[PDB]
Amino acid sequence: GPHSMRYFETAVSRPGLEEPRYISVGYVDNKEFVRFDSDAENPRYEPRAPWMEQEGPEYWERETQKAKGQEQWFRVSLRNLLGYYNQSAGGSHTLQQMSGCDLGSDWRLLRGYLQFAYEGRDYIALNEDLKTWTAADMAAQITRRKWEQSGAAEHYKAYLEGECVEWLHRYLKNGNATLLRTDSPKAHVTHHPRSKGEVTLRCWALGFYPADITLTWQLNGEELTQDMELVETRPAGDGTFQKWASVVVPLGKEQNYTCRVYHEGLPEPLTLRWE
């Protein structure tokens, strides 16, 4: 299916006069594969997936060098934004960056991506064309104009279509086994007798990978739109996910109600009821 590489960067300024904390997290198909943290004992890029251990010392050395330059770029930029927004260095400020590429099933480039936030709000993004910028407010326009004048988008376009694509191809090849795997959900229903015979029935789905799942409840072949309570998908911690959907209305007449689990890892959608 579709593939992606993404680097999520964060620089947090530190009130107590100290230098910002810089973190860079790399993802290959929404799974963490590398990580840099300026707060580490020895700050360097580290493998965060087993298949990444095969990259030689020259790789980690070069990536750490890049991260160090990024640390400085975020320090300068952090100071500039303070001036644009008439802020105090006595408070903590946040600069975030998201960049990478999407590929199709054939591993061909779909689109490049480059976005920035300041204080968790959109600041500036590179447009899909990878030639023009969209500033989010009056202060972000200062950056847009500065970046047009420096031919900045040309630098980003080259990486996003060149190196980003070439490196993701290598990672998809080296991570072959690890990346292709899916864990199918294991479902079951629980019943909790609530008040005036009105027992609540909860459909659990556990141990699934990836996170996308669909859970539904049906009253004699008719899907339940209202009443159905649905928790947000949560990580189990082992690398898998959990989710549950619950229906209230059923009294001492539970077998009319049926649950359905839809997941790409399933050899066929599951169906269950019970006590």
Partner: peptide, 9 residues
Amino acid sequence: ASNENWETM
């Protein structure tokens, strides 16, 4: 592999 940014903000 990651990228080195260009002009500062």
